[PDB]
Write a protein that binds this ligand. Structure first.
Ligand SMILES: [Zn+2]
Ligand SMILES: [Zn+2]
Lengths: 309, 309
């Protein structure tokens, strides 16, 4: 059994977003819209329900941990359910939460060489936190092969490369490198149960589709309904493909992709505050549910029991 | 009229603290203790109720802004009630929140040269955020005199120096400098109403007491009940004076200091998760109330109407 806990299900900014008055955010604050607030994207993984691996450390991490009881097992005066953190990239929204964990150092942190470079230079979290009881202990994610975190010995992690898009602060934003961005396959080696985790997905190739077919649960980018959603709502000028996100709708959209995966569990995560699927009364949400696709929400629990083969 | 809004009232770590199972934190999670959760120390100031100055940008800033409606005036598709941010020091718990505001740059940020040095080097927030639409625009706080922020033209800020204690990450933690730490006097120049704000206060001298007597409201360090509170609760080894905090109780304690200020409004803020005054049923809380002192809570509103003279 692999336990997957959705700590946060929104895109950057969360929902509602602090400075946003789009139809969704204003509607939420007004009480006129049936939607649930969401913190920024982050999941926790476990093979036993006691030892957890945090995937991405969001700026909302304090509220996220507090809302999920296994994060505080209370086995000692000081304690936490977090046994390791895996970073998929070096973006502020995926790393800032580490600052809020510094009272609990040392932490085992898994990330690529490229992300470690960013987090020792442009956003020098490793350097900063080294002054808190040894700080973050770097475990290198290699760009081929798999890894296993000791605390959850039955979870086998196999990262896969995504198009490189270093964050704006990065010394190499204008010079992208392999290892800037990855997605995760996670296997419970006791059952063969497999999670495909790609909260940021801007393109799909044949090899990607192949590896998805071997998965049991697909947890994938749900940022925008349409590629021009930001402009439609009047709160941004950047497009979906510009931000490295495939929209749900349209030719080559994620809903079209997911049509080829009837037997997988399918869940959208990393949902932007502008996305109508957040409206529980929207025809867009209705269409997602009609396609057998789920919309992640904070506190969602996914249990992977077994492999389909 | 000066509006003071307590966005967060806890010390670093907040209450409950994510990795803490002390009597208070465990009691809160158990439902067996009558206490209210608190986010990390931060206040907002206004002279008109519409334009706000944030004092310290805490890691809890998203939840803090969301809980206080004037922070979203909704005058445009993009909007915020934050017109400026004042930093009193460069500590992670007082600055991290800026990362969560980057979608709203440019921001006017007031801080000393020493804090600006830290935030361009060891924790390079200014450098990072410069890539978000101009980033943070530095306004230097000088080490003498006053300043006025344009958006609230009736608030006159006069900082006062505190003992220098640069954060652990700082290139000069072992070499403290004037300007590392300050407190604030804030005057409504329409009424002469004055706030004395010292959320971190480790010592008091004659000049400090003098300037306090000229204030109408004293909003001061409430971190620990006793100097050895951390050890008593079993969750730390550092002492109150070691962390630059005068405890409420004992010779030279803040309660003893506050005895000399009968006519000022007196409010404790920046309260540690270990502090028994958080227990609404504690005899420690009872003693505070008996002394005419208040315990800040998230969402507390303080209105300064006029000067006592
Ligand atoms: Zn919005
Ligand atoms: Zn505690």
């Amino acid at each position: 059994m692999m336990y997957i806990q959705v700590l946060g299900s929104a895109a950057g900014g969360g929902f509602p977003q602090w400075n946003c008055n789009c139809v969704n955010c204003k509607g939420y604050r007004d009480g006129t819209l049936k939607a649930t607030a969401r913190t920024q994207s982050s999941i926790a993984l476990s093979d036993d329900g006691v030892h957890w691996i945090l995937c991405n450390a969001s700026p909302d991490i304090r509220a996220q941990l507090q809302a999920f009881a296994p994060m505080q097992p209370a086995r000692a005066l000081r304690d936490t359910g977090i046994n390791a953190i895996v970073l998929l990239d070096s973006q502020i929204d995926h790393t800032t939460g580490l600052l809020s964990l510094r009272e609990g150092c040392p932490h085992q942190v898994w990330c690529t060489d490229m992300v470690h470079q960013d987090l020792t230079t442009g956003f020098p979290l490793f350097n900063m936190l080294s002054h808190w009881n040894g700080g973050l202990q770097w475990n290198r994610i290699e760009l081929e092969g798999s890894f296993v975190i000791d605390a959850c010995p039955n979870l086998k992690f196999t990262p896969f490369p995504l198009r490189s898009a270093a964050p704006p602060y990065s010394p190499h934003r204008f010079d992208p490198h392999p290892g800037d961005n990855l997605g995760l396959m996670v296997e419970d080696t006791r059952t063969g149960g497999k999670l495909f985790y790609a909260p940021g997905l801007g393109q799909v190739d044949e090899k990607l589709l192949a590896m998805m077919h071997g998965a049991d649960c697909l947890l994938v980018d749900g940022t925008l309904w349409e590629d021009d959603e930001m402009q439609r709502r009047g709160v941004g000028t950047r497009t979906g493909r510009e931000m490295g996100h495939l929209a749900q709708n349209g030719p080559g959209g994620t809903l079209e992709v997911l049509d080829g995966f009837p037997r997988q569990r399918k869940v959208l995560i990393h949902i932007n505050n502008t996305n109508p699927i957040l409206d529980e009364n929207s025809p867009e949400r209705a269409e997602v549910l009609r396609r057998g696709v789920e919309v992640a929400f904070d506190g969602m629990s996914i249990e992977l029991l077994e492999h389909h083969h």
